[model samples]
Target: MGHHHHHHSHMDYPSFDKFLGTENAELVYVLRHKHGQFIYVWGEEGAGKSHLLQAWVAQALEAGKNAAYIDAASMPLTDAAFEAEYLAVDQVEKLGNEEQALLFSIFNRFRNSGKGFLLLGSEYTPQQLVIREDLRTRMAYCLVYEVKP
Candidate 1:
């Protein structure tokens, strides 16, 4: 299954088991691959990235999955501000390098503890995203899907 995203200025999301083969555009494989791992939703500004992030959170919660939702654009949260023992950062495009690094470490350490991570940001790099390095690598995981994150 292919990945999916939600663009900003839009409000459409799929609840767990709510829109499997209908409203949901992602393939079964994408959703399954992300079943337990952290995910990075990367795309352009008008690509509905933010909307999808919110939907994913809701879906996870509704489906009884462990999940957390974070947005860099919504808050000017500093790198140290988002520090945590276990969590994944969403809307990463809204964060700087410092924050990304902090999240990276958290994800790496807890990724094996049966925890999941999610990093949502623009598909742009530091130059494109203007974000830092330490955080970028984690966002650039192995599978760079075609349309979704």
Candidate 2:
């Protein structure tokens, strides 16, 4: 039997250089500099939101920083996820009532801690999200970006 050092070895994630399109250059620059504590990226289907977020986390890890990439569709978001200095959560549009509540709490904690950054990926913008009113408002305060392809 063989042992794998990384659980994500089975998945192939793209690098920032692999992310194409001139329109996304500024977005890449901002992300590279870690400009904001709260960042929200929204895009239509196949717009590479997942790829961008995963690549971000990969870059952080490569820099020896604590990071995590969580796909809400596949994994549950919990307080422990915030242990990383950089966190990227994808498919937030699929979060249920309880998960949404958990996310709201996480957002509060992250904001108050004032040490790391949180990046959220969704198909809809903050105003359009069908989440809690307060949560939506909180999301709007993020450095919002639309990933166009």
Candidate 3:
């Protein structure tokens, strides 16, 4: 291990304090305290799914939990198991075949790991999302919440 050095990457995101708990008090509680290993939040446009996910991630991180915020529309799909304690994957219906497969595998692994997730979708229940059958089925197992406008 000569010349080896530890590397840490810090991702900047919006602060958890920016989150307003007008109606999502329950979800905010879970994310704040590191409870619930699996959660799915769904909403239509203006229902604020993305903001909620971001706020949750920021809170999880602020609480010193390892976390990552992934926007399926922008971030590349990872085939490996997540190294974070919490992972927030937003807009899952945007995932392509490979990304869907990657998330499917990761979800299976995350089930056994000490990790948790906050998956967001738009305008539908996990059952109604137009994604891979396996992935949609998998998401059905999580605690689902609807974000109302």
Candidate 4:
């Protein structure tokens, strides 16, 4: 397979089969068929947004793709994080101003590269987020989905 490290092992993380919801099927299908696209999954607390993102990352890695999961709320982000083929960024609402700028650049890099998938998990929609206007617009342009709580 691939060589990578994470704070926690992905073996214990949930998988797509463990994600119980109506949108699971569609979400899985889209990510599998459509690469290099931004998929924003948002919902309130306890909505399992993080779970889904983690699961997707685990699945991607199992399938031999370069995947990385970053919890923006607890972990600091950097430009290097964007190197993964499948990057899942959770708790996007917690990013600081500087991190927002970093994320904006990372988003641009992902969009420009056009060769991977960017999975974003947030509690608020792009329009409702307190981030920069340009970043908000960029996020809004993605395929948005509201994971019911």
Taking the tens digit of each residue's C-alpha lDDT, what string does model 2 give over 1-149?
A: 22222212222344356444658566455354343566776553213456566667767888898889788878887767756888878877777877788778777877777666778776556678677787887786577653332
Q: Any idea what lDDT model 1 has?
A: 0.48
lDDT of 4 at 109: 75
| Model 4 agreement with the true structure over 39-108: per-residue lDDT tens digits | 7765522133465666677778878877887887778887777667788788777778777888788778
A best-first ranking of the candidates according to their lDDT comes to: 2, 4, 3, 1
Task: Write candidate 3's Cα lDDT for 4-114 as tens digits.
Answer: 223222323433565454776755544533335576655432133465566667777787877777777677777443666577777666778977887887778777664
Query: Candidate 4: how large is its RMSD?
Result: 11.6
Clashes of 1: 11
lDDT of 1 by residue, 1-149 (tens): 54554444323443356544464455332242222344444443223345555555556655665555566656554445333322334445666655556666665765555444454544443335655656556555523333534
Give the TM-score (vs. native) of candidate 3. 0.63
In model 1, the runs with Cα more than 4 Å from the true position are 1-36, 44-49, 76-91, 126-128
* Model 4 lDDT, full chain set: 0.66
Overall local distance difference test of candidate 3: 0.62
In model 4, the clashing pairs are none
TM-score of each: 0.51, 0.65, 0.63, 0.65
TM-score between candidate 2 and the true structure: 0.65
